[PDB]
Design a protein around this ligand. Sequence first.
Ligand SMILES: [Fe+3]
Ligand SMILES: [Fe+3]
Lengths: 272, 255
Amino acid sequence: NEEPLLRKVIFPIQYPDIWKMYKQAQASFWTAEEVDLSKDLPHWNKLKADEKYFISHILAFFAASNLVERFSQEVQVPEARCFYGFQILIENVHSEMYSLLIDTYIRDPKKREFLFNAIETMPYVKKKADWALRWIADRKSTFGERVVAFAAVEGVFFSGSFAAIFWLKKRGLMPGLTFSNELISRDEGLHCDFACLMFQYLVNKPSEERVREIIVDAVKIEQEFLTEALPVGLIGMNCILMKQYIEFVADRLLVELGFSKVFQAENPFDFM
Amino acid sequence: EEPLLRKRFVIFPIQYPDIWKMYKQAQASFWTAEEVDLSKDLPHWNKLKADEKYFISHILAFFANENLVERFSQEVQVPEARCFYGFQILIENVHSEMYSLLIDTYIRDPKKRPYVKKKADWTFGERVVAFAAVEGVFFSGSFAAIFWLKKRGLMPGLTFSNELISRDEGLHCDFACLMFQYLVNKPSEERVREIIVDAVKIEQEFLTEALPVGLIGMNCILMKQYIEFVADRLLVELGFSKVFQAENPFDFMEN
Ligand SMILES: [Fe+3]
Ligand SMILES: [Fe+3]
């Protein structure tokens, strides 16, 4: 309780800018039903064996993916709690959408079964697990550290896959997948932005050194996935350029938290 | 332990269609505070008596917890249930914003801007019922009081917000009953009564001793009856029998 966010009639609003972001969340409310998948199987069938493997897998990883309930309890400002309550909900809309997309492109139930049991095995899930239990759950962890981890989960992890799905939009393919990709990644941006806003109200925040360790570690994990394990070559993208994008994204985040760049990586993707 | 408390990778194909249908119903009743127009209430408020202002402000003060759903939501494993609870969390935030706006609209003077204690102190199944009780028994008499204001044609912002909020609590309370059905081990009829009947006592004391509905022209004996009626309706919903046998006295609460 040295911290304004942490210390124990919502109106009038004390924090207009926390509140403005809640209001932006509400403004952009949607449901998985809103998204039209009727024109997708034709485009899907035009994809090649390697591109279907890739798309079906990154979807499964999106689906495989509860720290927000913890922040909502911990943070004591009503304005913030409203934003986290909306975040809980919209995340559940994300899951529905991924389930819908899979069910639309993987029609046979046993194929879905093979697919998911594979994905539980894989490194990307274990590595992201180990990272969160290292930087969130450790309980030598601090609140400032968790805020930075929180921001990374939203803005570094899956950043490369949103980009991959945007690359397909460039080629006029799969309008339901790409349209839902836009809504979801927009939602993540806002969530990443909110975490960066909270970080600005901290009395005790972590060393630039420490902020780099959390962030650059996620970059390690995300780059490995999309270049080593499930390479973007599978859908005609360049690996080197993707590693660079992940770093541009991570540099942007460091600067949002008020620190200097580490990688100096420019954005390689016009379409982004 | 229990199906609702035990362990999914992908929502579809839906497993508990009845719980899912409730989530979809919640989604279909989405609203925000700004959709309720409070710009004709102050003139009405200024025409009220001293005792009507007293009553309305005080119930609005007690209207102004979903810590508990941030616990149910974490404990329940069935994805369809977790979806409903997510949406419930959102809607109670809409409710609080609504009640803050109302207070702010009528009690413009900052300086001006009990029952509380009895609620505070007051197995998964027990918590479900106590949870159902909060939605259903607590504040049911306050909902009826504002439906009385509507019958006299007063305070249209308050009364409309009340219709919306009442409807949500109905759904939220119904949902706690659907959860209760799915329990394999549930407390006996004896425990439910204790929880529901303690609830009724607290609510009855509140709207007839501390802050009598007589202040807005209502009959207390009848308000006591209606609270008992709501409690009865809950007991039967949870799969038990009535304890009070109370008829709903209010013709205006019949739609
Ligand atoms: Fe998110
Ligand atoms: Fe409720």
